[PDB]
Design a protein around this ligand. Structure first.
Ligand SMILES: CCCCCCCCCCCCCCCCCC(=O)OC[C@H](COP(=O)(O)OCCN)OC(=O)CCCCCCCCCCCCCCCCC
Lengths: 93, 148
């Protein structure tokens, strides 16, 4: 057994009215260093994990697409379009 | 690549034409094709704002250079890739190919329809297409015309 006598005493008897004021500026400085090392360092890894599948597996993110057919309108010099909904699928393996 | 090869080249008039159904067609067609070099202007502006903040608060120059790079990096990351823009480009290119084919058919037969067009403009004051008017007429006949 470890002789934890002094630590046991510390745990049993601790002040219950002692507190220290914290310099807001230094607290903010440390926290914003933490944010700097999160957004700009771990953000790279997080964004890679989130996006790389969306780059190498794009077809699963855009399920439905549209296709068009066109006809002329000679007497008005216009073009008439008919649309169609399709399931976005692979093509020409 | 196959669709773009069939189209060959794209002119701004057609892009603005298709803007009706996809207001971000230019913003999507830039991210699919190597048309022009894209600078992360929004990212650089945010970086300049952070630079002004640091200059006001007297931060070391390393911090402000890093805070200029970071928003630029975010802008680049959110700009490149974006394979959805390729799907939208495919849709636009299909539309453009159909439009160009129909336009070629218009030009090819323009002389043949000159006389009929001249006769038609003087009788119908509407600019609506012949197909739409004929479908409406067919519905009108199917509804009101007595079967007899
Ligand atoms: C559509 C609407 C969107 C609206 C968005 C709004 C965003 C608001 C963002 C507010 C940011 C406030 C940043 C405040 C930083 C304060 C830093 C500070 O108090 O500490 C100063 C300290 C000085 O450093 P020192 O070397 O000790 O020099 C002594 C100088 N007296 O400095 C340091 O030690 C270095 C501090 C580094 C700070 C890093 C900041 C990183 C910010 C990341 C933001 C990410 C946002 C992502 C948004 C995505 C949107 C798609």
């Amino acid at each position: 057994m470890l002789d934890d006598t002094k630590y046991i005493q510390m745990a049993q008897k601790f002040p219950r009215n002692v507190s220290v004021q914290l310099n807001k500026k230094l607290f903010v400085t440390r926290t914003w260093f933490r944010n700097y090392y999160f957004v700009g360092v771990f953000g790279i890894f997080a964004y890679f994990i989130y996006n790389q599948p969306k780059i190498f597996a794009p077809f699963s993110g855009y399920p439905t697409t549209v296709a068009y057919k066109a006809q002329p309108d000679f007497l008005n010099d216009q073009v008439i379009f008919y649309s169609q909904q399709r399931q976005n699928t692979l093509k020409n393996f | 690549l196959r669709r773009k090869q069939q189209l060959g080249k794209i002119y701004p008039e057609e892009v603005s034409s298709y803007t009706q159904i996809n207001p971000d067609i230019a913003n999507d067609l830039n991210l699919t094709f190597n048309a022009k070099l894209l600078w992360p202007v929004r990212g650089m502006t945010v970086g300049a704002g952070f630079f002004a903040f640091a200059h006001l608060f007297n931060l070391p120059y390393s911090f402000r250079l890093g805070l200029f790079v970071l928003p630029t990096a975010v802008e680049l990351a959110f700009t490149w890739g974006n394979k959805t823009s390729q799907f939208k480009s495919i849709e636009f290119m299909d539309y453009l190919l159909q439009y160009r084919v129909s336009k070629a058919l218009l030009e090819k037969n323009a002389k043949h329809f000159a006389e009929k067009k001249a006769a038609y403009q003087k009788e119908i004051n509407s600019s609506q297409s012949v197909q739409d008017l004929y479908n409406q007429l067919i519905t009108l006949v199917s509804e009101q015309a007595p079967s007899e």
